[PDB]
């Protein structure tokens, strides 16, 4: 299955039409015909294959990692600390990209569901999108391509120094 906590679906809405026709009803006969022509034999072959999969079952796990000390807690150069620190940072960068992918997929799903009036019960997901992406824009954006982790920490120090000067001129 898939976790519906992280992949939210809105609850279903389905009207009940009832003609008020006398042609009557081509597509009703045709959807019953499609059901009895495709939906039964594919499911019978799939039941055969599901018994064959129920002969014996493998398992795969989710890969688990520990926590490194820091990049802020290593020594001067001393590579065999910073290597571990920066690989943990690189995995944070990878999972952060996948977080942004998840938020963008949720937004596209909201667009296709909610019809031509976009601005009703999609504005909340648009707001959380602008939240997370303003964070990512100020965090990981302007660093070029020859990063390891050190340019990110330099950006971090520079930005919080900018905030310190900002509250210095403010108060």
């Amino acid at each position: 299955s898939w976790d519906k906590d992280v992949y939210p679906e809105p609850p279903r809405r389905t009207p009940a039409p009832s003609p008020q026709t006398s042609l009557p009803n081509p597509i009703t006969y045709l959807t019953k015909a499609f059901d009895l022509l495709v939906d039964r034999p594919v499911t019978l072959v799939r039941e055969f294959i599901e018994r064959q999969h129920a002969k014996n079952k493998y398992y795969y796990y989710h890969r688990e990692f520990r926590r490194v000390p820091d990049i802020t807690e290593c020594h001067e150069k001393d590579v065999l600390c910073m290597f571990e620190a920066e690989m943990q940072w690189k995995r944070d960068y990878k999972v952060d990209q996948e977080i942004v992918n998840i938020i963008q997929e949720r937004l596209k799903a909201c667009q296709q569901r909610e019809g031509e009036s976009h601005r009703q019960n999609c504005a909340k997901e648009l707001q959380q999108f602008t939240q997370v992406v303003k964070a990512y824009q100020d965090r990981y954006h302007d660093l070029g391509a020859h990063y390891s982790a050190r340019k990110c920490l330099a950006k971090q120090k520079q930005r919080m120094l900018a905030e310190r000067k900002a509250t210095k001129e403010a108060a």
Binding site: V100, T130, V133, K134, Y136, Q137, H141, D142
Partner: peptide, 8 residues
């Protein structure tokens, strides 16, 4: 316009 200009 870097409100969201992520793909640089």
């Amino acid at each position: 316009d870097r409100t969201f200009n992520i793909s640089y």
